């Protein structure tokens, strides 16, 4: 009956896994899987998280759908973290936004209205980027592309290619785009940069769809998504897809946003309605555990302003270990800048290690990396520091 | 920009909701939503979900992504509820099963799959079902129609007229079947009946499809699975999608199993693999906490024997408040049999009322139910009845 049926590879990153997993090196990292681990190497359970959920635990209450939107609280929350508080966009009603199942959620949402009403749409995405973009696109039958993102040779962006790629494509098609902490690179645009991208998403009447996973892992709250925001202020026909499951350390409640921003109210009202439309097509309505979650911890301003707390603990560490990796390598490795690994933001890096490094960092020392050289760099902390950053100038002397 | 954007209509269930809430009767009822309520007219929390989630918060543990398939104690429980504890074809290896975002998700993925490779099957529904199931499958770019199903003049079905239509499909046309618990009627095909369609099904080569939302809901669960049980040992391709959402009363949580019965272990592994390769470009993973519910009660022995005791008690009120409903009638309205309110099995009921009696039963007495005649039983209780039922008689004299 299903022989016709082909066998499926497997995710990637878990094929990966399973090898570091059997991998008997006593001394063995992984920094492949882009997962949060704190000072101890384990995911963390946040402390405004096991509030809220001691509150959800009391008393354990009846379990009725959510809307398809999800909960007004769980959207706001997205809102307000995205556009800001009160912000003019919001005030104005001008934001359509549903929770999702996490980003991924939102991202295929997203792409389902996209591919259904802007059939002709192309969609292209960072060279590179997260695997899980092209599967979500390309399942809704929608074409997908690449624009130039990274430069190989300068670690930096292929900026002058990029926008002059950006002015090639049609009205309507739509560009995938990280406001800050580029997974896998960790190479983000300046602020001066946006402008010009957006500038040019104006001028080619292009759809920007603004994927933030990480929002607070950058500069700040409001930092990360200042592309976002800008192109608000633009008056551009946005698509945002926000998770939370890096931020709240829910990656499997599956809680994000799906926010699209609009030229007037009653667009805002067509559009709201088709999400809606959209849902009740794919799973009906979101989980509940996850959004109120998401509804207690937004919305109450002493779990708000702990999370970010929270949030800026796990950034400020992330950002230590860029730098104990760096000081270890320029302390070690003299006429080589290092300082693409403290430029770059978010939880990934992309290291500048060859292939062939990657697999000797491998073999050698039991340490986990992408082949194109991604790094996670919460996988590193106190305890593994210096011998992966010191295995890694061994790799690059030979 | 958003002007070619249509306005979405909204869900005629929660569209009808709505106009009760805003109904200022006082004596109104809401017999419109598919939703389990007890004696109060309240959703239960279960017993033994209470149990689980106590177990869960106890301690609030780390919240990883849970695999694409999602816990496999919550597959197996899927597996053993539907085809019976240890049963050959589970022994053999021969069924597919992923957790889904209840249902509703399951329809969607196994929709998928369908149009994936089997892009020429289109799908046949019951004259008439729930809502949801076209928009489902014709979200998956499949053709959908009709076969006959409920006889308007009997309030039995088109049982002849049924199964002529199937001998005019196609090969691997798929029909979506419901073991017990009709939505919208109650009408159930017999032991007997289903014996027939099967035999069609299998000699036209079609693809039943299986959803069974109401398991324990109908005569109990090992009976409401016949049509399941059957087609496996028929040796019938089968997909299952499962709901817990009632009988579990966990709604919100998002909760059910999609199970693909195969002929060989190899045939399997590949509709195991792709089953995840769909989850992957939809919402990459499910829910957590619904999945440890689902898990921790299904596996329990105490509480597994606990929630079907449970289902059974649901049930049973559910029968009693046909009865009762019939006795009020048949006492007042003399040469109408009332036996089909009995006859019919789950939630719903075909209450054999026109859509003028329907609408008169909103505006002298605020009673809501859908205008094809749907009932929700379980809106029914003991402090409503009388009034509901005394309403319908005067309905009927006009
Ligand atoms: C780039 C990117 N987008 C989206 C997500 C969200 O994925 P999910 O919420 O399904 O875990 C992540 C994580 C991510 O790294
Ligand atoms: C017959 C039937 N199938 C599928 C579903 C899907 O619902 P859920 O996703 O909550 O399991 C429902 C109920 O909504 C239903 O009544
Ligand atoms: O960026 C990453 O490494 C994550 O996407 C890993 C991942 C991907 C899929 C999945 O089901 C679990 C983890
Ligand atoms: O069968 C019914 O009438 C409903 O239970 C279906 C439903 C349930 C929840 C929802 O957000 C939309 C439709
Ligand atoms: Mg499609
Ligand atoms: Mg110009």
Redesign the pocket.
Known sequence: MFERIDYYAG?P??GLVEKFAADNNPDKVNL????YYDESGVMPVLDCVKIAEQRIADPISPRPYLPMAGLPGHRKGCQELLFGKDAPVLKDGLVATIATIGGSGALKVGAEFIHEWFPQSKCYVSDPT???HIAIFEGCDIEVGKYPYYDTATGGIKFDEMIAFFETLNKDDVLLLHPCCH??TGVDLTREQWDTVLNVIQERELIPFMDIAYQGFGEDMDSDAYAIRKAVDMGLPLFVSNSFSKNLSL?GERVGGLSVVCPTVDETERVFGQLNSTVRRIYSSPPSHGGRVVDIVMNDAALHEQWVGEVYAMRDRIKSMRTKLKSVLEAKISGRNFDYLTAQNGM?SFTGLTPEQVERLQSEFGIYMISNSRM?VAGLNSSNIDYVANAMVDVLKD
Chains 1, 2 share one sequence.
Do not use: K, R, T
Request: aromatic share 20%; net charge negative; charged share 5%.
């Open positions: 995710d990153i878990l492949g899987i882009g997962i997260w695997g899980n997974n896998p990656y990934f996670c």
